[PDB]
């Protein structure tokens, strides 16, 4: 259905242990496809999915040259960031940047994105209009006016509206078999006693791609939102994901419970129940 391309930058300072480290990873939905680490012997951008390997040499140089330059820039930004917050040159700090475009289920730009963070807290974010900024504090306002004064938002709108979509669509075509294929989850309910009066029903979802999924337990048709322990969706390692939902039911009442699954890989939402095989 819908698709997105996202680049994630992380710059970490480590005083007394060398220069700050810069890593850049690129994604198309939940599939990683590029990586760059300034901490690698001979740092260059590397392929992380089958479909990007066909890209020519000039593509890899264009990429590497950008990320090498970004390594130097984010090193300066980490120093600047100390001034802005009156911080010592002894602490370790992190700057993170998230950016990219969303493609509407047709193929035109649905919305652009570009946020920055300082030590895990929002700093500056490009607004949805791709023309203005939202600075989180007085330090970020310094950055805002520097950006406004240099019309950065302009260059970004052009990337998010042009090149970002062009390439995403290009990657989407080349990686058709996987990028444009949804693998529904395999489902089943397990049962583990926990007392003579209560037992745990656990609904599983495995083998699915993309990561987005919804699991719910209903008792007599009522959602058990506040009673369902849900684990965070995790990666299996084969590109697919796993997730489960559990609820502790009273013994003899397991049939009043249903588990509901919704995934873009399923034509209709699934309902399951415990299947005690006789």
């Amino acid at each position: 259905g819908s698709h997105s391309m996202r680049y994630f930058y992380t710059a970490m300072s480590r005083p007394g242990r060398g220069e700050p480290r810069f890593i850049a990873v690129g994604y198309v939905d939940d599939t990683q496809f590029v990586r760059f680490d300034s901490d690698a012997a001979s740092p260059r951008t590397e392929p992380r999915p089958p479909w990007i390997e066909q890209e020519g040499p000039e593509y890899w140089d264009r990429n590497t040259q950008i990320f090498k330059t970004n390594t130097q820039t984010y090193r300066e930004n980490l120093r600047i960031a100390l001034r802005y917050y009156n911080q010592s040159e002894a602490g370790s700090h992190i700057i993170q940047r998230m950016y990219g475009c969303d493609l509407g289920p047709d193929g035109r730009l649905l919305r652009g994105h570009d946020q920055s963070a300082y030590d895990g807290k929002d700093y500056i974010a490009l607004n949805e209009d791709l023309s203005s900024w939202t600075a989180a504090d007085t330090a970020a306002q310094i950055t805002q006016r520097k950006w406004e004064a240099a019309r950065v938002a302009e260059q970004l709108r052009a990337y998010l509206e042009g090149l970002c979509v062009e390439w995403l669509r290009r990657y989407l075509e080349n990686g058709k078999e996987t990028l444009q294929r949804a693998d529904p989850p395999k489902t089943h309910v397990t049962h583990h006693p926990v007392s003579d009066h209560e037992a745990t029903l656990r609904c599983w979802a495995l083998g699915f791609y993309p990561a987005e999924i919804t699991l719910t337990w209903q008792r007599d048709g009522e959602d058990q939102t506040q009673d369902t322990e849900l684990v965070e969706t995790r990666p299996a390692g084969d590109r697919t994901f796993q997730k489960w939902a559990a609820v502790v039911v009273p013994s003899g009442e397991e049939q009043r419970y249903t588990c509901h699954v919704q995934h873009e890989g399923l034509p209709k939402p699934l309902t399951l129940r415990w299947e005690p095989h006789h």
């Binding site: 820039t73 600047i80 240099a150 950065v152 390439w167």
Partner: peptide, 9 residues
Amino acid sequence: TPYDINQML
């Protein structure tokens, strides 16, 4: 492919 704008704080 990534962007090429000036990201100086």
